[PDB]
Design an enzyme around this catalytic site. Structure first.
Site, mmCIF file in Angstrom:
data_model
loop_
_atom_site.group_PDB
_atom_site.id
_atom_site.type_symbol
_atom_site.label_atom_id
_atom_site.label_comp_id
_atom_site.label_asym_id
_atom_site.label_seq_id
_atom_site.Cartn_x
_atom_site.Cartn_y
_atom_site.Cartn_z
ATOM 1 N N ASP A 25 0.851 -1.265 -0.025
ATOM 2 C CA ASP A 25 0.113 -0.172 0.044
ATOM 3 C C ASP A 25 0.820 1.312 0.006
ATOM 4 O OD1 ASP A 25 -1.946 2.031 0.226
ATOM 5 O OD2 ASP A 25 -2.698 1.138 2.125
ATOM 6 N N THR A 26 0.956 1.784 -1.273
ATOM 7 C CA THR A 26 2.160 3.199 -1.335
ATOM 8 C C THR A 26 1.159 4.275 -0.586
ATOM 9 O OG1 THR A 26 0.793 3.660 -3.302
ATOM 10 C CG2 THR A 26 2.941 2.376 -3.471
ATOM 11 N N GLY A 27 -0.054 4.270 -0.297
ATOM 12 C CA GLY A 27 -0.893 5.135 0.483
ATOM 13 C C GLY A 27 -0.674 5.128 1.742
HETATM 14 C C1 LIG Z 1 -6.193 6.567 2.958
HETATM 15 C C2 LIG Z 1 -4.893 6.831 3.014
HETATM 16 C C3 LIG Z 1 -4.430 8.211 3.029
HETATM 17 C C4 LIG Z 1 -3.999 5.964 4.271
HETATM 18 N N1 LIG Z 1 -4.470 4.652 4.307
HETATM 19 C C5 LIG Z 1 -3.920 3.587 3.305
HETATM 20 C C6 LIG Z 1 -4.952 3.309 2.099
HETATM 21 O O1 LIG Z 1 -4.320 2.720 1.051
HETATM 22 C C7 LIG Z 1 -6.355 2.475 2.649
HETATM 23 C C8 LIG Z 1 -5.871 1.019 2.970
HETATM 24 C C9 LIG Z 1 -7.093 0.267 3.394
HETATM 25 C C10 LIG Z 1 -7.753 -0.719 2.560
HETATM 26 C C11 LIG Z 1 -8.800 -1.523 3.124
HETATM 27 C C12 LIG Z 1 -9.430 -1.347 4.472
HETATM 28 C C13 LIG Z 1 -8.920 -0.321 5.037
HETATM 29 C C14 LIG Z 1 -7.698 0.311 4.722
HETATM 30 N N2 LIG Z 1 -7.134 2.321 1.684
HETATM 31 C C15 LIG Z 1 -8.389 3.023 1.646
HETATM 32 O O2 LIG Z 1 -8.937 3.496 2.438
HETATM 33 O O3 LIG Z 1 -9.070 2.792 0.323
HETATM 34 C C16 LIG Z 1 -10.557 3.181 0.336
HETATM 35 C C17 LIG Z 1 -10.898 3.566 -0.932
HETATM 36 O O4 LIG Z 1 -10.687 2.485 -1.736
HETATM 37 C C18 LIG Z 1 -11.363 1.397 -1.120
HETATM 38 O O5 LIG Z 1 -10.704 0.250 -1.310
HETATM 39 C C19 LIG Z 1 -9.907 0.078 -0.105
HETATM 40 C C20 LIG Z 1 -10.932 0.269 1.122
HETATM 41 C C21 LIG Z 1 -11.162 1.923 0.174
HETATM 42 S S1 LIG Z 1 -4.897 3.856 5.906
HETATM 43 O O6 LIG Z 1 -5.443 2.429 5.666
HETATM 44 O O7 LIG Z 1 -5.968 4.847 6.593
HETATM 45 C C22 LIG Z 1 -3.348 4.145 6.888
HETATM 46 C C23 LIG Z 1 -2.987 5.163 7.383
HETATM 47 C C24 LIG Z 1 -1.778 5.303 8.217
HETATM 48 C C25 LIG Z 1 -0.997 4.122 8.032
HETATM 49 N N3 LIG Z 1 0.115 4.302 8.781
HETATM 50 C C26 LIG Z 1 -1.429 3.047 7.590
HETATM 51 C C27 LIG Z 1 -2.637 2.973 6.907
#
Ligand SMILES: CC(C)CN(C[C@@H](O)[C@H](Cc1ccccc1)NC(=O)O[C@H]1CO[C@H]2OCC[C@H]21)S(=O)(=O)c1ccc(N)cc1
Ligand SMILES: [Cl-]
Ligand SMILES: [Cl-]
Ligand SMILES: [Cl-]
EC number: 3.4.23.16
Lengths: 99, 99
Positions: A25-27
């Site tokens: 997860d690059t984000g």
């Molecule tokens: C939103 C980003 C700025 C940060 N996020 C990583 C992100 O990749 C998450 C990673 C993620 C993935 C699944 C569930 C929870 C978190 N993806 C996410 O929220 O994606 C949403 C939009 O597309 C959908 O597909 C996935 C859920 C939806 S995060 O999971 O909140 C997070 C924040 C801080 C850290 N250290 C680690 C992870």
């Protein structure tokens, strides 16, 4: 390897003696793993994202094997619905985004 | 380009004639942008992230430039803390993860 993004980029990791699947997860700034025990000291942290914040435990200097590549760094542990390998460990295995 | 991950992979996007910063996020299924006006009708969607569920507005077939690459596809609009470019558009610009 080269991983396309048609599907979630899941890989096998080994952490604390356990095999798990995790999302590259690059984000994500930091690596976040579902609740499990890890050795050593920890401190609390809040991480924010879509939906708001989650409370986690921060463990430092934890070795993880990510798709066969060893890396060491901070691992956050909490009630995440998906194990996430974040940038702190992606850098260590030489991961890049290419287009 | 080849983007390393020592810093957040932020890029310039152009949507509705406006330049914005967004995060390339392989852990996001969907692209999610902060509140802004887009043309056409929208549909409801619930997405789940690290803090829980979030309602968003789903706009389809929106023209967006990402780091100079043209994409046309779904944009979710809602109170996300950062603009994120998810796999739905990363695939359109030909992005892969490599290590
Ligand atoms: C939103 C980003 C700025 C940060 N996020 C990583 C992100 O990749 C998450 C990673 C993620 C993935 C699944 C569930 C929870 C978190 N993806 C996410 O929220 O994606 C949403 C939009 O597309 C959908 O597909 C996935 C859920 C939806 S995060 O999971 O909140 C997070 C924040 C801080 C850290 N250290 C680690 C992870
Ligand atoms: Cl680290
Ligand atoms: Cl490097
Ligand atoms: Cl799309």
């Amino acid at each position: 390897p080269q991983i396309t993004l048609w599907k979630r980029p899941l890989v096998t990791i080994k952490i604390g003696g356990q095999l798990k699947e995790a999302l590259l997860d690059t984000g994500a700034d930091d690596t976040v793993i579902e609740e499990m025990s890890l050795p050593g000291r920890w401190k609390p942290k809040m991480i924010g994202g879509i939906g708001g914040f989650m409370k986690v435990r921060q463990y430092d200097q934890i070795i993880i094997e990510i798709a066969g590549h060893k890396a060491i760094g901070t691992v956050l542990v909490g009630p995440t619905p998906v194990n996430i390998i974040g940038r702190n460990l992606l850098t260590q295995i030489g991961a890049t985004l290419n287009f």
